[PDB]
Amino acid sequence: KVTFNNTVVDAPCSISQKSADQSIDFGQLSKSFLEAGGVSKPMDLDIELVNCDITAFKGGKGTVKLAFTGPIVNGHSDELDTNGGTGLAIVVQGAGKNVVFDGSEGDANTLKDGENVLHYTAVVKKSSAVGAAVTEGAFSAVANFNLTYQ
Amino acid sequence: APCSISQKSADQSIDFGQLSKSFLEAGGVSKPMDLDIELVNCDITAFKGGNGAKKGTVKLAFTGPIVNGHSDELDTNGGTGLAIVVQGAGKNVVFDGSEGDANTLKDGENVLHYTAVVKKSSAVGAAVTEGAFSAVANFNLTYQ
Amino acid sequence: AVSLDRTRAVFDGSEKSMTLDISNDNKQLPYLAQAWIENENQEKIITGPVIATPPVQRLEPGAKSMVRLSTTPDISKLPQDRESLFYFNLREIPPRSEKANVLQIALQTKIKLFYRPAAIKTRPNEVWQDQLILNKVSGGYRIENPTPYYVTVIGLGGSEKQAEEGEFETVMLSPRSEQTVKSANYNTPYLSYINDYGGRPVLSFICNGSRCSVKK
């Protein structure tokens, strides 16, 4: 006789984006425009959930807590501080709600029926820091997309 | 009669390890694993008691619980959606006791080589669920 | 780009070490994978009793590797008749971007890591969650977990279908502990939980007044 053995488990989600380095480019922006109170065009920040059963992020409770984390503009958890000393900050919108990066729970069910991509939009703007001023120069930032399973 | 299964091949185990429910449910197939039947102390030479004996050939047959409509899928004990599929010479094996193809045997020992995999069964409604699974198959030989 | 192989990890106390599989699902670029351990309050711990190694590693495109979980002599100071809670973390470091003015996303997977002493070692598909006791109270039920294991409850309703699809607030009971959850009273209570494999079985109760035990 031959006895076959195996085990089956629920796998955690894996993510990916249109870009291999998981980034979105805001292109060039006018220092004066942002300085005057103008904002960048909201960019599509789409995260594809793969290698898992998405029947936990769907819409229509959740066993997977979802949250974003990154340095924030003091006093503004919804403003993701950036690198480059440009004075700019990044804001991310989920599904009618803003994301916070102080490590606060986000909406883990923002999945539109028939899809495995969570949709967000991100805009660049002058920091809300008192006496902040937009300056020429390239900026960048990294946000941690945290999935904590129960 | 001509041969005898090796002590190690008569009772063997194959462990495919831990698999992803997602992978399986989406049609994923596990890595293959070797399943070898070792025939030892074969005396085909002495298999000369009536040369009708078409060479020292042997046909192997497998038996075990089967998935409805698919006799080439060994059913897993417990659970519901999984299935084991075994291959030889690129040909699938059926678990209803049907004799396989003829294998030429030389004196001494010969090794029948097969490979196995785990996957979702082809049965309708088949749903992969998590947990520990095991499937058992028995085999018998007939010599020609 | 980097992924873990399970949603929870059970560490067999009879073992001194075990491994977890990780993967760089990105076929084009290399990503780094950091791993560390947190205590029950999710605070990072570096000095044991459970250790994660390597703390960081490079994964070429499509590369499969693993993280090792090891224990220190202090592991024996943990209670040996119940489980102890830890958390395992896997977070990637995407390659620095080429473009300027960019935002990058980095995935961090956090899962429960249950230290299971040898004395309570378990068998392949064993169930202990069927020892859960339900006591009806003012506001809902008081879940009682007398087993030496952590039990994660994800549902509680009057039907099997309601236990699963029902809107419930997931709560985890510690070994030998109870807890009250707000809920409507039900004739035939049904509970849903997450087992070692990530499965979500459904338990059916039968009540004898304010007490409800699982139906065998």
Numbering used by the authors:
A (entry chain B): 10 to 69, 74 to 163
B (entry chain C): 20 to 163
C (entry chain A): 1 to 216
Which sentences from the paper describe this structure?
The P pilus, produced in uropathogenic Escherichia coli, displays the adhesin PapG responsible for targeting the bacterium to the kidney epithelium. The PapA rod is formed by more than 1,000 PapA molecules assembled in a right-handed helical manner, with 3.3 molecules per turn. In a process called donor–strand complementation (DSC), the G1 β-strand of PapD inserts a conserved motif of three alternating hydrophobic residues (called the P1 to P3 residues) plus N101 (P4 residue) into four binding pockets in the hydrophobic groove of the pilus subunits (P1 to P4 binding pockets).
However, by investigating a different PapA mutant with the additional mutation T101L, we obtained crystals of a complex containing one PapD molecule and two PapANtd1_G15N_T101L molecules. This T101L mutant was initially designed to fill in the PapA P5 pocket. However, this T101L mutation had the additional unexpected consequence of stabilizing a complex containing a 1:2 molar ratio of PapD and PapA. It clearly shows one PapA molecule bound to PapD through DSC in a complex very similar to PapD/PapANtd1_G15N; however, this time, the Nte of the donor–strand-complemented PapA molecule is bound to the groove of another PapA molecule, and thus this ternary complex crystal structure provides a snapshot of PapA before and after DSE. The core sheet structure of dsePapA is in a closer conformation than that of dscPapA, as the β-strands on each side of the groove of dsePapA are nearer to each other. Also, the “63–74” loop is ordered in dsePapA and not in dscPapA, as this molecule is missing residues 70 to 73 in this region. DsePapA is only visible in the electron density from residue 20, as its Nte is not interacting in the groove of another PapA molecule and is thus disordered. Figure 3B shows the surface of dsePapA bound to the truncated Nte of dscPapA and that of dscPapA bound to the G1 strand of the chaperone: the PapD G1 strand interacts as expected at the P1 to P4 positions in the groove of dscPapA, the Nte of which interacts in the P2 to P5 pockets in the groove of dsePapA. In contrast to what is observed in the PapE/KNte or any other chaperone–subunit complex structures, the side chain of F152 has moved out of the P4 pocket of the DsePapA structure and the P4 pocket can now accommodate the N15 mutation (substituted for wild-type G15 in the PapANtd1_G15N_T101L mutant to prevent higher-order polymerization). F152 in the dsePapA structure is allowed to move away from the groove position because of the T101L mutation. Indeed, as shown in Figure 4B, the T101L mutation and the insertion of N15 induce a rearrangement of the side-chains in the P4–P5 region, leading to T99 moving out of the P5 region, thereby leaving room for F152 to substitute in its place, the new F152 position being stabilized by L101.
